A and B are shown apart, each in its own frame.
Chain A
Amino acid sequence: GSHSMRYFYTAMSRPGRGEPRFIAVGYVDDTQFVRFDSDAASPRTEPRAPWIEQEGPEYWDRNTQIFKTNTQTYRESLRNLRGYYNQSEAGSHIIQRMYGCDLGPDGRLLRGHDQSAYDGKDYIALNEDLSSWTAADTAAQITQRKWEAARVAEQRRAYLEGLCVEWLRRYLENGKETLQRADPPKTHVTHHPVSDHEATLRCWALGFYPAEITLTWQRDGEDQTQDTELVETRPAGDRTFQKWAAVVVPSGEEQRYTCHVQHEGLPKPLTLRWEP
């Protein structure tokens, strides 16, 4: 299977309430394995998946040093970005960063990502060439010119093609029993009359990993996109995810509807009907 690793940074100012909070979490695919929070009583990098606990004390101190220094750097960055937009010192603002590498089914680098956002809009992104930037606006051009001056993309590139891929592979090996195990959805179809002439069919997928999944309703073999109610894929809390799709159908037409399920956990798609 293909795999990826991502770190997610959130730096949040809060004037009148101390210095900005810095939080970092690490993921391998849909599995978090590490966290750091500057707001912690004793801020340090903490395991969040059993397979990362075997990393030695020097691993944890290395992470912790990286994150503490980032905490300070993102506080300067928030200062700067407030200036770039001529904003007042009254408001709270947020920088977000998500970065990482993607591996193909061969363990080979597919590509890297390094994107940042300010108050929830794209701010600056590293292009897929890992060599040039995309600024969303004249404020982010300031950042771009400053990163070009200091050859920042070269640093990002060395990391994304090198250490990122190396540690991802090491994590995938160490947590192979789970990281490289796809658990198929457990499925079923429910039926609930809404009136004398209509009824709800709900298609359920439970206990799957990873989160990525396709759930669709067809009527006489045709896609029922606009007529399907479809909840966001949701975590169960045991590493697995859940989802459902629902359609209101004319009573007596139920067998004309099929639920289709695609997931890495099963060899061929499932086709399901309500079974009374």
Chain B
Amino acid sequence: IQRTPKIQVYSRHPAENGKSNFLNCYVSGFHPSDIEVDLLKNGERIEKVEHSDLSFSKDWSFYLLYYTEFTPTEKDEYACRVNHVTLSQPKIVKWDRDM
């Protein structure tokens, strides 16, 4: 039996257009641990996203944070794209600055 990822997309600091920041995609509650996460800028994969070391919660489910430097503007779209053994199609979660 398997557990599908929870996904949150958000910034380290409150978003200020033209101000440097971090874009975070936090994946949690998944099992087993193999997972593929991309951060997307305008639908295209950002290179050299870093991530935290694999760990897990008290319910044994895993969690990872993927992050990269970005500078928010009003017209750029940011997203996080997750695939996992439980998902048939890659799941896409858009960044929303008040979420």
Contacts and interface: CB of A to CB of B under 8 A. Distances in A.
Interface in B58-80: 58, 60-61, 65, 67
B26 A96 contact: no
Given A94-B32, A236-B24, A120 B61 contact: yes
Contact of B54 (A10, A98, A121, A236): A10
Query: Which of A32, A98, A231, A235 gathers most chain B CB within 10 Å?
Result: A235
Interface string B6-43: 10101011100000001010101101111000000000
B86 interface: no
A58 B64 CA distance: 30
B98 interface: yes
A171 to B, nearest CB: 18
Interface size class of B (residues with CB under 8 A): 20 to 34
Interface size class of A (residues with CB under 8 A): 20 to 34
B92 to A, nearest CB: 18
A119 interface: yes
Contacts of B61: 120
Instruction: State the majority secondary structure of interface residues on A.
Output: strand
B71 to A, nearest CB: 16
B47 interface: no
B12 A232 contact: no
Interface string A239-263: 0001000000000000000000000
Interface of B: 1, 3, 6, 8, 10, 12-14, 22, 24, 26, 28-29, 31-34, 52-56, 58, 60-61, 65, 67, 98
Interface of A: 8, 10, 12, 23, 25, 27, 32, 35, 37, 48, 92, 94, 96, 98, 117, 119-121, 190, 192, 202, 206, 231-232, 234-238, 242
The 10 nearest A-B residue pairs measured at CB:
A120-B31, A120-B60, A117-B60, A236-B12, A35-B53, A237-B12, A234-B26, A25-B53, A237-B67, A8-B55
